[PDB]
Every structure is written in C-alpha cells, then in structure tokens.
Amino acid sequence: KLSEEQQHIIAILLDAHHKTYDPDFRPPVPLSMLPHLADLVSYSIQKVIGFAKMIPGFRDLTSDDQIVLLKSSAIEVIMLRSNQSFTMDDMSWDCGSQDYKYDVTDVSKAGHTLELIEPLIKFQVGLKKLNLHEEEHVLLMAICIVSPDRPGVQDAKLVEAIQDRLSNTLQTYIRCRHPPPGSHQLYAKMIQKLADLRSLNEEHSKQYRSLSFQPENSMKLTPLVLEVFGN
C-alpha cells in the first residue's frame, strides 16, 4: 500500500523531472561533434543539479555531500534520463528534428570510442525493454544520485536513510502499481541498470582522463564540464 508520504515523494520527483527534462549550443558538425555534444552534456548537468535539489531530503545534506553525489552521478543521470529521447526504431536519440537527432555515428565523433558508445547503446535498449513507468524512471534517477557508496561521502548514514526511503517507495510502487508479471524482479533489474551505469561511468572517466590530457580536446569543453568531470 502506497503511503501519503510515498505518493508525495513520487509527485515531487515527477514534477522535478518535468521541470528539468525537455527533448544556444555550438552547432552540430572524429571530434567534429565534441563542441555540440559537450554543450549538450554541460546544459544536461545543470538540469541534473536542478532535479537533485528537488529530491526530498537532498537539501538536508551538507553542501560537500551534495557536491560529491552530483560529481559522481552526473554522467550516469544524463545517460539514464536520455532513455526518454532514445528510440529503438533507429538506435538514436531523437530530440525532435534531424538537426538534434543523434545516432551511433554522431556520438562516436566526440572523442569517445565504441568501448563507451556500444555499452551505452546496449544499456538504452535494455532500459527500453524494461518499459518503466515514468514514476519508476524518476525514482531510479533519484536513487542513482543519492547513493551512500559514492567516493567522498561524509554522512553515509543520512544518504543511506534518504536512499532507503526512495528504494522503499520504488519497491512499494512496483508491488502496488506495476502489473505482474512485468513487476517480477523489476526492482532487481532496475538496480542492475544502476550497476550498468557505474560501469559506463568508469569507462567514461578512463576515456575522459585520456581525452582531456590532450589540451586541444579540453579546449573544446565547457567550464562546468571541466569542474564536474575534472582537469
């Protein structure tokens, strides 16, 4: 049974998502797409921060814990939130028009190899196959951000208490509202997707470190990307 509190949490996370996700940048053009896609990701980081600030209990963390959680999660949340614009019709992110339509070729021209891109595309396909409710999608984004196992977290106990309330809200939603048999081990498959995102984060960091030790490539980034993903 979904408590008043649990429904309040879902309503809040749905509105936060609606306020910060909508399918100004340098134009789309092996690195030709890095200016455009670095701008897109930079913008997307700002929106992830916007979403995070509206997660019930996130405000009650120290500024230091908020920073470490957003630094560690930002790329995972961007990959995860991108699933809504992703289409299996052509393995592309279709943000409206052919201008802002991104296939394997496009996202392969921002200095990352198929060693990131191929798992990234397979992750989007896997996530489409789960066919999540938007309620489940936004809880998963919130659980992704507020995880007590991120490096540097000071108050793990408060982060864990917040993530446990979100997790309990998700498990309860799945049992009460997700149709069986689609609900069977759905919580476990969602947590596995979070593990896939940590793996994608690891591969991204490794490629980011290499790419961004080429100053000509670092030059094409944004100040926010350099602050969040590092120098």
């Binding site: 700002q46 921060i49 916007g50 600030k53 500024s63 920073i67 630094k71 926010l224 602050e227 969040v228």
Partner: peptide, 10 residues
C-alpha cells in the same frame, strides 16, 4: 574547489 557547482546548488 567547485564554485560553479556550489552556485548552481544555490
């Protein structure tokens, strides 16, 4: 060390 993040969090 993260003034842009800090600013966006405010």
């Amino acid at each position: 060390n993260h003034p842009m993040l800090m600013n966006l969090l405010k």
